[PDB]
Amino acid sequence: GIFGAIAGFIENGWEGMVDGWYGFRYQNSEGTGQAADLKSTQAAIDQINGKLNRVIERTNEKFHQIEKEFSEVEGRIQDLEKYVEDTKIDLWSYNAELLVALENQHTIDLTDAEMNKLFEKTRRQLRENAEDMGDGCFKIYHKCDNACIESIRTGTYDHYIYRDEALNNRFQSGR
């Protein structure tokens, strides 16, 4: 996908996440855990539900039309009835093929984007108190219990609070 998140820097998906489409796993002072992110899951799904409805109008009633199968040869008029039906079917077949390709591309790309968006949003909160490990994980330079991890998932994490602590742990170096 254009963002290189899914099937990119995120090495793979998690079969063990039944809770949602996107989310977090973590290892902290209280062991390990997992939580789904509902906002971004819902942003994806809203885009994908009823996707086709935004292009095709609800199916229309059609009643008497032209005949399309003929039991005798007639020439000119039958030739034209045949060609009209053929022209129509080919055009729709093209339409449906293209629609699928377009829509799917859109779907692939928007879901990559939601993943990336959520990574970015997380990184931005953490600010200088953490490191992008390059595989979709963050190294956080402080004691971050479940409550603290909960604060990051809910968007309430105040980075100034932990800054001095993360500084000490980060910069235990030089040499």
Partner 1 sequence: NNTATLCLGHHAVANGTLVKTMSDDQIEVTNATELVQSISMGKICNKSYRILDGRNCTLIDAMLGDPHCDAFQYESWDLFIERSNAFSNCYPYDIPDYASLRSIVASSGTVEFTAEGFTWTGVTQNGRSGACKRGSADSFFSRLNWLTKSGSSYPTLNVTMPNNKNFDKLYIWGIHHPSSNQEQTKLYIQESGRVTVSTKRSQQTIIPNIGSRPLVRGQSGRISIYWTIVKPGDILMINSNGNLVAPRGYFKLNTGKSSVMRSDVPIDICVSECITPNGSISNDKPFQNVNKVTYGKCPKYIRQNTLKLATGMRNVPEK
CB of 11 to partner 1, least distance (A): 7
Which partner in partner 1, a copy of itself, none is near 84 (CB below 5 to 8 A by kind)?
A: a copy of itself
Which partner in a copy of itself, partner 1, none is near 162 (CB below 5 to 8 A by kind)?
A: none
38 binds partner 1 (CB under 8 A): no
Amino acid at 48: I
137 binds a copy of itself (CB under 8 A): no
The torsion angles phi and psi of 109, rounded to 5 degrees, stand at -70, -35
- Binding residue for a copy of itself (CB under 8 A) from 46, 120, 143, 145? 120
Are the CB atoms for 112 and 40 separated by under 8 Å? no
167 binds a copy of itself (CB under 8 A): yes
Are the CB atoms for 10 and 118 separated by under 8 Å? no
- Residue 62 vs residues 82, 89, 120: alpha-carbon distances, Å: 19, 16, 50
CB of 125 to partner 1, least distance (A): 10
Nearest Cα residue to 22 out of 31, 32, 10: 10
83 binds a copy of itself (CB under 8 A): yes
Which partner in a copy of itself, partner 1, none is near 146 (CB below 5 to 8 A by kind)?
A: none
DSSP state of 143: -
C-beta of 79 vs 128, nearer to partner 1: 79
- Cβ neighbours of residue 8 closer than 8 Å, sequence gap 6 or more: 1
Residues forming a β-bridge with 132:
138
Site map 60..99 versus partner 1, x via CB under 8 A: xxxxxx-xxx--xxxxxx-x-----x---xx-xx--xx--
Pick the piece of the chain touching a copy of itself (CB under 8 A) from 10-18, 30-38, 106-114, 143-151.
106-114
C-beta of 81 vs 150, nearer to a copy of itself: 81
- Residue 40 vs residues 27, 50, 115, 117: alpha-carbon distances, Å: 22, 18, 8, 8
